[PDB]
């Protein structure tokens, strides 16, 4: 008369020398924008990734800024949500609670979709004034829209060029830029850029008009960037833990949180053991922490 629960995704007797967990919030923000700035199309697809280095059978509870925020007065509006099997869905439907017993090591806790209240990290404003059939004048400004303390990185703006181009001279003060004729685009790279900033690029584009009477469609300005926050607005409120056999809780745990927002289609038009103890697995930016 005693039933033995056996979780298919977590063995028993897991031991870590130090109880700790990792949370990676990985979002791709996509956009189609008009030259004037009208949002024609936008969505974020995100996923919370978790690396559990916890001992025993910990009973966790993931807390974010959902529509429980609407009860206590920034948030994330989740259109669609899919969970790992470990997540009790019963509780999520009754109380919006993401409770679970995590697998050992890395697992994807949830993926999601978002279309409203997206923090669009960048706006591109393009001008193209034709000045004769000889020349084209191109002015492209990029506005960063996030906290000034924060830095976007690995930025690349691909401004398309028309096929009938004999050559182009370009100038920018921030970053570096090359006209890659093979590509049919001037490619503009900036290493870092803080929030609430401007930056301009000007390109005098000389034309060779052989064809006449036909102006064909051209690709839009596409941007790549990496941003240290969730463009959906996702903020991790807590990761509560309770393991009643070993009597330890989140107060006895180190939680490591990271946000990696990355551009998607952002377009604008013109474990092992040893002695019982499990071992953490291991190209990434190095930071000296006391407990690392």
Residue numbers in the entry: 153 to 225, 239 to 435, 477 to 488, 492 to 501
Reported in the publication:
Proper operation of the pivotal CME cargo adaptor AP2 requires membrane-localized Fer/Cip4 homology domain-only proteins (FCHO). FCHO1 and FCHO2 are similar in overall domain arrangement —folded N-terminal acidic phospholipid-binding homodimerization F-BAR domains and C-terminal folded μ-homology domains (μHD) separated by a ~300-residue, low-complexity intrinsically disordered protein linker, which has been suggested to participate in AP2 activation, although how it does so is undetermined. We dissect the network of interactions between the FCHO interdomain linker and AP2, which concentrates, orients, tethers, and partially destabilizes closed AP2 at the plasma membrane.
To confirm the identity of the extra, Cμ2-proximal electron density as the N terminus of FCHO2 linker, chimeras of Cμ2 alone with N1+N2 attached to the C terminus via 30-residue unstructured synthetic glycine-, serine-, and alanine-rich flexible linkers were then created, crystallized, and their structures solved at resolutions varying from 2.0 to 2.6 Å by MR using an unliganded version of Cμ2 as a search model. The Y pocket is variously filled by parts of the tags of an adjacent Cμ2 molecule. The N1 interaction occurs mainly via complementary charged interactions between Asp318, Glu320, and Glu321 and the Cμ2 BR3 PtdIns(4,5)P2-binding site containing Lys167, Tyr168, and Arg169. Isothermal titration calorimetry (ITC) measurements showed the binding of FCHO2-N1+N2 to have a KD of ~25 μM. Mutation of key binding residues in Cμ2 (E320A+E321A+K326A) reduced binding fivefold, and mutating Tyr323 to serine rendered it unmeasurably weak. The FCHO linker does not directly interact with the Y or Ø cargo motif binding pockets in any structure but does pass close by before its main chain changes direction at FCHO2 Pro327. The weak density that follows on from N1 adopts a range of conformations forming crystal packing contacts, which we believe to be nonphysiological (mutations FCHO2 Y340S and E336A+F339S have little effect on N1-N2 binding).
